Amino acid sequence: TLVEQILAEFQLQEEDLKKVMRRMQKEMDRGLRLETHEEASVKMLPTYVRSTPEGSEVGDFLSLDLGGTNFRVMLVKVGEGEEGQWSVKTKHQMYSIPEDAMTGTAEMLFDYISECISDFLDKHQMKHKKLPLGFTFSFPVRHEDIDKGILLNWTKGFKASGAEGNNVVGLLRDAIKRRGDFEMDVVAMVNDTVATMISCYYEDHQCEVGMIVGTGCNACYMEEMQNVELVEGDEGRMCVNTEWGAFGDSGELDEFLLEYDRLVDESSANPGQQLYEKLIGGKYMGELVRLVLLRLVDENLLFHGEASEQLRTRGAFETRFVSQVESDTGDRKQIYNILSTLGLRPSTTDCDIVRRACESVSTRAAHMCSAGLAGVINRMRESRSEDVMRITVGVDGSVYKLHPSFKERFHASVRRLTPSCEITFIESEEGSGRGAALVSAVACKKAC
Numbered sequence: 001t002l003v004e005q006i007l008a009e010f011q012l013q014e015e016d017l018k019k020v021m022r023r024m025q026k027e028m029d030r031g032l033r034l035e036t037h038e039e040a041s042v043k044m045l046p047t048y049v050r051s052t053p054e055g056s057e058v059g060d061f062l063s064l065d066l067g068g069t070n071f072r073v074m075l076v077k078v079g080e081g082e083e084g085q086w087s088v089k090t091k092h093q094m095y096s097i098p099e100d101a102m103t104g105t106a107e108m109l110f111d112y113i114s115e116c117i118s119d120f121l122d123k124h125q126m127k128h129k130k131l132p133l134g135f136t137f138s139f140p141v142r143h144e145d146i147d148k149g150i151l152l153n154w155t156k157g158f159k160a161s162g163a164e165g166n167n168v169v170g171l172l173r174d175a176i177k178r179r180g181d182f183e184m185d186v187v188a189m190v191n192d193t194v195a196t197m198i199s200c201y202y203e204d205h206q207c208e209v210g211m212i213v214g215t216g217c218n219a220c221y222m223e224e225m226q227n228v229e230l231v232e233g234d235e236g237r238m239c240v241n242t243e244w245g246a247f248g249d250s251g252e253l254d255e256f257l258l259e260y261d262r263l264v265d266e267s268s269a270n271p272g273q274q275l276y277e278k279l280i281g282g283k284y285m286g287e288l289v290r291l292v293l294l295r296l297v298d299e300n301l302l303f304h305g306e307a308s309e310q311l312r313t314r315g316a317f318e319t320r321f322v323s324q325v326e327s328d329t330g331d332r333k334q335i336y337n338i339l340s341t342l343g344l345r346p347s348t349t350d351c352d353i354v355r356r357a358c359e360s361v362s363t364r365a366a367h368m369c370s371a372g373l374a375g376v377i378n379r380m381r382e383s384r385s386e387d388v389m390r391i392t393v394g395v396d397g398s399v400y401k402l403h404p405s406f407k408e409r410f411h412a413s414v415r416r417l418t419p420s421c422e423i424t425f426i427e428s429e430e431g432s433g434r435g436a437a438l439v440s441a442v443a444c445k446k447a448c
């Protein structure tokens with residue numbers, strides 16, 4: 001081997017994870033306190049989602065989801081169950097998002113979103129209801145309230161101009177009104193993490209953390225209002241959006257970061273930001289693999305020294321390929337077919353090396369991510385008193401959900417890092433739609 005030494009750079013000892021855990025908890029602490037909130041890399045954003053909901057509206061709700069690659073519009077119906085509110089998606093539709101909108105101005109993009117909304121309401125006999133609308137908007141936002149806050153900055157390659165710094169919900173509003181076609185009561189805006197968390201509440205009241213491991217990666221959790229300094233008040237709990245994707249932007253990860261991570265960064269829409277998410281999320285995983293594969297070929301270890309034109313283009317090793325290669329059964333048959341598609345003609349040993357390379361990146365993501373989560377869960381242990389903390393974490397995201405063994409490595413490692421917690425993991429059913437709408441419903445009791 002010169003291979004195993006190159007791949008071994010990805011490993012993390014147990015003390016590595018603990019270091020990142022402890023540093024993350026610190027950054028969480030700093031994000032929450034008035035003296036350090038402004039400059040904290042982990043912003044710890046109040047969301048105005050609050051504990052003891054205590055009764056809500058019912059009937060139909062409309063939810064949008066922007067921040068996945070697609071954009072989704074759905075109808076969710078909310079009624080009364082014993083536990084709290086049931087809910088269920090009843091109509092749905094995805095809309096691609098043209099790059100002439102994406103490079104656009106903000107108000108352009110929310111016009112495109114407005115067009116999609118009318119389209120959906122035609123096709124459904126619906127233009128003539130003014131519906132309450134919960135909006136899952138998966139980007140960092142500083143809220144003033146449950147229905148108002150500014151975009152701090154775009155992440156995950158999004159770039160529409162003139163949105164950073166404005167009232168995202170006002171954008172939505174000035175597009176709906178800017179096209180007469182329909183009436184919509186925008187009652188609530190939430191992060192994906194919060195929506196996921198909230199949708200697990202009906203079947204499990206201990207769900208107090210939501211986590212997304214998808215294109216991007218983040219979590220949110222329920223904090224003690226006393227510890228949330230940026231919202232006056234000391235009673236109860238408010239869900240906080242940690243935005244942990246940005247941990248490492250004040251150099252907290254420098255010692256772990258690798259030449260490949262240094263290159264995914266430089267070449268990205270958002271250089272110097274979202275460093276932690278860059279090690280874990282699906283927008284970056286394939287690309288890390290691609291760069292590891294390129295270093296192996298330049299070392300002559302792989303495809304003996306030569307790479308197709310595709311292999312050399314940014315973006316070509318799709319994250320979904322990372323997870324198909326790790327599903328190969330041992331016959332190389334689907335490793336072969338992916339490599340053959342990118343214009344390579346690999347040998348037996350090429351296929352194995354390529355698989356080793358995917359394992360190395362995905363195992364590191366799983367481990368890095370387990371340290372953030374045990375950071376959050378051990379912080380919650382601190383504030384609390386039963387001898388064993390039992391807690392449920394709601395999760396969503398194609399990496400966590402669909403990658404062949406990421407979830408189990410990730411569960412094994414969160415559990416090493418969390419003695420005397422007992423953790424249940426729930427994969428959210430339609431977390432984002434039902435979530436927005438579950439919150440929307442409680443927000444409505446405070447307005448209509």
Ligand SMILES: CNc1ccc(Sc2nncn2C)cc1C(=O)Nc1nc(C)cs1
Nearest residue numbers: 049050051053201205207208438439442443
């Ligand atoms: C069903 N909706 C909720 C369920 C639970 C919780 S907190 C909790 N308690 N145990 C676990 N968890 C997470 C909050 C909400 C909620 O929507 N709260 C809102 N407050 C405002 C002001 C608007 S919406």
Ligand SMILES: OC[C@H]1O[C@H](O)[C@H](O)[C@@H](O)[C@@H]1O
Nearest residue numbers: 138139140155216217218245
């Ligand atoms: O969508 C998953 C996560 O992606 C990136 O972290 C976004 O900044 C975040 O807000 C969202 O929660």
